[PDB]
Design a protein around this ligand. Sequence first.
Ligand SMILES: NC(=O)c1ccc[n+]([C@@H]2O[C@H](COP(=O)([O-])OP(=O)(O)OC[C@H]3O[C@@H](n4cnc5c(N)ncnc54)[C@H](O)[C@@H]3O)[C@@H](O)[C@H]2O)c1
Ligand SMILES: NC(=O)c1ccc[n+]([C@@H]2O[C@H](COP(=O)([O-])OP(=O)(O)OC[C@H]3O[C@@H](n4cnc5c(N)ncnc54)[C@H](O)[C@@H]3O)[C@@H](O)[C@H]2O)c1
Ligand SMILES: O=c1ccn([C@@H]2O[C@H](COP(=O)(O)OP(=O)(O)O[C@H]3O[C@H](CO)[C@@H](O)[C@H](O)[C@H]3O)[C@@H](O)[C@H]2O)c(=O)[nH]1
Ligand SMILES: O=c1ccn([C@@H]2O[C@H](COP(=O)(O)OP(=O)(O)O[C@H]3O[C@H](CO)[C@@H](O)[C@H](O)[C@H]3O)[C@@H](O)[C@H]2O)c(=O)[nH]1
Lengths: 392, 392
Amino acid sequence: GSRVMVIGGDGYCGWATALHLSKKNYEVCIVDNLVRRLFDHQLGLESLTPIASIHDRISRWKALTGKSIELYVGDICDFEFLAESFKSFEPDSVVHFGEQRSAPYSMIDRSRAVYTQHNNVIGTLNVLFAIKEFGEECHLVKLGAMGEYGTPNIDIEEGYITITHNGRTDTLPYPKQASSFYHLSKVHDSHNIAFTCKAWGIRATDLNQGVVYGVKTDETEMHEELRNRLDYDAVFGTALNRFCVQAAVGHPLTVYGKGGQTRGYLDIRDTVQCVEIAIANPAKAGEFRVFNQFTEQFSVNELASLVTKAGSKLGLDVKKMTVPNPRVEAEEHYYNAKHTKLMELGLEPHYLSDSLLDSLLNFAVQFKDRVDTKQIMPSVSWKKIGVKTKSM
Amino acid sequence: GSRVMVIGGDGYCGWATALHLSKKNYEVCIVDNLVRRLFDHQLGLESLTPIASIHDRISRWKALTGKSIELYVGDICDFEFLAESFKSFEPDSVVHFGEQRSAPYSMIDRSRAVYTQHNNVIGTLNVLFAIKEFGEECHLVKLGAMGEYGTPNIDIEEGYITITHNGRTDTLPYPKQASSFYHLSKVHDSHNIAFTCKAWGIRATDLNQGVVYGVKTDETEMHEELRNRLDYDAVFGTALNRFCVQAAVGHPLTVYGKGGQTRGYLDIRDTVQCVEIAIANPAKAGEFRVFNQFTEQFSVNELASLVTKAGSKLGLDVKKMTVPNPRVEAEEHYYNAKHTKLMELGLEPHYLSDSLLDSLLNFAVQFKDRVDTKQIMPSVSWKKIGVKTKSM
Ligand SMILES: NC(=O)c1ccc[n+]([C@@H]2O[C@H](COP(=O)([O-])OP(=O)(O)OC[C@H]3O[C@@H](n4cnc5c(N)ncnc54)[C@H](O)[C@@H]3O)[C@@H](O)[C@H]2O)c1
Ligand SMILES: NC(=O)c1ccc[n+]([C@@H]2O[C@H](COP(=O)([O-])OP(=O)(O)OC[C@H]3O[C@@H](n4cnc5c(N)ncnc54)[C@H](O)[C@@H]3O)[C@@H](O)[C@H]2O)c1
Ligand SMILES: O=c1ccn([C@@H]2O[C@H](COP(=O)(O)OP(=O)(O)O[C@H]3O[C@H](CO)[C@@H](O)[C@H](O)[C@H]3O)[C@@H](O)[C@H]2O)c(=O)[nH]1
Ligand SMILES: O=c1ccn([C@@H]2O[C@H](COP(=O)(O)OP(=O)(O)O[C@H]3O[C@H](CO)[C@@H](O)[C@H](O)[C@H]3O)[C@@H](O)[C@H]2O)c(=O)[nH]1
């Protein structure tokens, strides 16, 4: 074999996924403009782990396994490029990881908020038109976001909710409440895709994924040049990965506000597993499937405690600090998000364990010398965002 | 006064509104790039009524009343232009009519779907950033769309719905189900604005307006050069206006599919009244108000019957025809949309009457010679939309 186009395949989730699908014998190609690497240069950021170029990454995989991952370098917002890549590869499935995924980045200034929505929304529209025009039966596996739902006072369902209002009943799209221009772009994406499923018969699966943690997967650990990136800076780094790196370098864990913010999380190993499951068990024509893709819920305070305990076993004397929250969000809220669709399809989860934390912490300690502590604290305010293009 | 910036002020709703607000003694400016006029040239379309240039329109209003409506010609997607206009005028309220509003236009091809979403979503984001940076207390009166709600099997509320799910209760944004790339862009707009209200304290009112009908308002009828446009073509024309022109020229009323499609409608005279009410009674800081802006619900078949009866009184022997529906939508559906917020604020509606239809029909008969019958039938398919840029 089945042919899979992995848009955003040079990224954190995409690279691990591309290697896994190739290993699982799918014919794979990567479509990426590598803009994520440019952002690192422009903002003065760097991965904890040194990573190889996309060309060397692909070359190494071929040298080790003999398998060739085709590469198409370009911006999917450029339809000519996307169309040519689609017609050249003829994918049976498209996994779309190719979007600006940082909430902080989307809040830096007007230019970055606009770039985020334009890049994400238009790129996704182009993908939908490419599928419709060149391969209508192609299954779109889209990366959405648990953040699309916000933090309502009721249980969060997997995309849909059956409501009884004024004596009548109907099943409707779950109300969306995004908290950043980035999360908003995903809400727009989801609405756009749902429409094309009904109007054109597109088959798609929206994976509303929670926060990913970890850096190792079976494939990326096979050789140093296959190593994935591990972000710890305040722009692209996420909660758990950030805390592990902070613990390793002796920086107090950065708890934003009260720390009651609760979210779904999952090991990167499950990210690749879930994507493969979505591909192996495709949506039907005209069907817009929605899966909440995470394995466990944790509050920020809970993560801090887990990392502190894990760090103690390594003599890291982990400390915690309360950082004035740069974001506008509920710091104490109800949270009960449903997640059974992937489990019903055979997901064998890697729940957060002492072993994982020990491994991730030792990893951060291993490359502690590469950590730029100046990038640990957040400097992007949700409320103070301006129109002048900022230079970090 | 009070200063009002009318974005899209050269358009159908915007021009009538700009004149009305000026008459009501608000200081008014019009921000428009006049792209709507370019679309007419590019697609071979033309208004039933001959209209004057925006410059001659404004000059005539000044000659008659002595009042000057300031004009800023530019694309609001160009932030430099928008910022300069905002700083020059210093609006207390911004009424945003400046978007690609045609559902058929948004479905012509990929380029037009992408243009629709980019122009609308990015332009609106720019407006939000301009307000935040140059006049945070400025009230945004946004034109949304009743189409954002789709046609669910339950009552449609005014933006929000209180739900009891699994033993818990909460008031959430009403589930959105748009049926075109244009309607989708409005859903995106609404979500984006709602976010800024919470994050930045923006005050806004989303006017989810129904289908507008009519061509006359007190101000536009004061002189021929102030005359508003009246679209009847299948791209920009809407249901009732189209039927009236069809009746006048002897063309069978174009009922798409079964004709059970039910929607909210309102006289253009109420469009201007509602906008003024929204301006005179502003939203509070951080509040995202949502009003369903229409006065009555009608099915397509009901409109056909009303126009036929009205036409008979003018000896137009109106006939009806069933056109294979170019759109993907429910042709028989439940529809009960709530609309009381504007009434509670003092709306004195002009319900559809025999007088209005007689006037509108005679108007169409008056300019029947200008009607290009080749543009009456729809040629844009929701399902057959392609990627090649079309030339109509
Ligand atoms: N990292 C997480 O914790 C997490 C959690 C939930 C969902 N996701 C989602 O998974 C997807 C991938 O996330 P990630 O962490 O791998 O991100 P990433 O930034 O590491 O990877 C994204 C890749 O997309 C590419 N890209 C962006 N815009 C592109 C364009 N216009 N054309 C071609 N390529 C483009 C970038 O160059 C980059 O290689 C995103 O949608 C993201 O929101 C990630
Ligand atoms: N006409 C209706 O029946 C109806 C019904 C409900 C809601 N509305 C809404 O009211 C608004 C106005 O509708 P209308 O019928 O007056 O439309 P219109 O096309 O007559 O007017 C829109 C105006 O906006 C201007 N414009 C578009 N993009 C612009 C940009 N980037 N920069 C500056 N100016 C720009 C166009 O040149 C045009 O003069 C739209 O949001 C529409 O969806 C209209
Ligand atoms: O050092 C930190 C980092 C984060 N947080 C909080 O932890 C929560 C999660 O934040 P973070 O880990 O930054 O993730 P998100 O910004 O939600 O974004 C990630 O997880 C999302 C899932 O919804 C994906 O959609 C995004 O692409 C991905 O970047 C939030 O309440 C943050 O305010 C802290 O308290 N301290
Ligand atoms: O000749 C016609 C024209 C329309 N319809 C149907 O009538 C309904 C209303 O269509 P139309 O009058 O074209 O309006 P919309 O496409 O809904 O759009 C208008 O009304 C919307 C309110 O939701 C605004 O948001 C849009 O900007 C404005 O163009 C639909 O079911 C159409 O399929 C017919 O049966 N015959």
